[PDB]
Design a binder for this molecule. Structure first.
Ligand SMILES: O=P(O)(O)C(F)(F)c1ccc(CCCCc2ccc(C(F)(F)P(=O)(O)O)cc2)cc1
Length: 297
């Protein structure tokens, strides 16, 4: 069973060794476009770039580049777009991507300001009477409402293509207490949040891929997507213990570099998937238990 393996690794203190094996076996593909001198100011970090083969292209004749990758999980039957936290000059690009890809939801796992340094730009309106307009991409964003919780906030936003005047409702899921290179507080808090995104219907195949991002778009976002995909797999092959988390992660890194940034986030991923498995195979009360333990109120 999954628990026995998790316990064996914990006992021998091998999480750092497993994580290191992952970095060494991980795919390596070119990122030429990301490295073009003209795209230098479109990347938040120097050594974090989307692979050329899976990068998301903007539908604009000028510069189609944005630091975002399309993670397509064939067997699990789900796609996610992982991107960095928008910079002061790429907020228009960010929303242009949401529109063109037809995304229904956006998942933010970092904070605009963490420990002083600006870890991300304020790309969505904080007050309803203050809509935002992105002149470069000709888009309008309005805060329709928001439900604030102890560790996460869900916002309803209206995105409008000012060119065609078409309107779309975007759901914003902001996890506010997940530190850089850190982990969520308990599997219950994480899963409670993950299931909030699921039930909203934002991850449905009827919509474009959900856009997920943290600061660099690989650590926290990698953890969120790995857990979701694994819970998806062990509900599909109805033989959960066959799902090899390490292999799933390596499959994901084929689409974007450095997913999961610490040995501890890897361990958490196992903890979250194991705890989440309870639901996937029977228990229809553990969800309330998670909401209970999460202390979202
Ligand atoms: O000479 P200097 O020291 O100034 C420097 F240039 F070498 C220099 C270059 C690059 C970096 C930052 C590298 C990316 C960090 C990053 C990765 C992951 C996460 C996250 F894991 F946290 P995530 O959850 O947002 O993905 C956040 C940030 C630092 C310093």
């Amino acid at each position: 069973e999954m628990e026995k393996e998790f316990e064996q690794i914990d006992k021998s203190g091998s999480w750092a060794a497993i994580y290191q094996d992952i970095r060494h076996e991980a795919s390596d593909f070119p990122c030429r476009v990301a490295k073009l001198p003209k795209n230098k100011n479109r990347n938040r970090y120097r050594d974090v770039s989307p692979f050329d083969h899976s990068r998301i292209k903007l539908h604009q004749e000028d510069n189609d580049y944005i630091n975002a990758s399309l993670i397509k999980m064939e067997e699990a039957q789900r796609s996610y777009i992982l991107t960095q936290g928008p910079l002061p000059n790429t907020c228009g690009h960010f929303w242009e991507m949401v529109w063109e890809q037809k995304s229904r939801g956006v998942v933010m796992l970092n904070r605009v300001m963490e420990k002083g340094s600006l870890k991300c730009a304020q790309y969505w309106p904080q007050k309803e009477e203050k809509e935002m307009i992105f002149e470069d991409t000709n888009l309008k964003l309005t805060l329709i409402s928001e439900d604030i919780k102890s560790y996460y906030t869900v916002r309803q936003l209206e995105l409008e293509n000012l060119t065609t005047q078409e309107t779309r409702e975007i759901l914003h899921f902001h996890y506010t207490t997940w530190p850089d290179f850190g982990v969520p507080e308990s599997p219950a808090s994480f899963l409670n949040f993950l299931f909030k995104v699921r039930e909203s219907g934002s991850l449905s195949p009827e919509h474009g891929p959900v856009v997920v991002h943290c600061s660099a778009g690989i650590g926290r976002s990698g953890t969120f997507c790995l857990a979701d995909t694994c819970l998806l797999l062990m509900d599909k092959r109805k033989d959960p213990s066959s799902v090899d988390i390490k292999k799933v992660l390596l499959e994901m890194r084929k689409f974007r570099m450095g997913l999961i940034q610490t040995a501890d986030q890897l361990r958490f991923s196992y903890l979250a998937v194991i705890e989440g498995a309870k639901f996937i195979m029977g228990d229809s009360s553990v969800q309330d238990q998670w909401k209970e333990l999460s202390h979202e109120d």
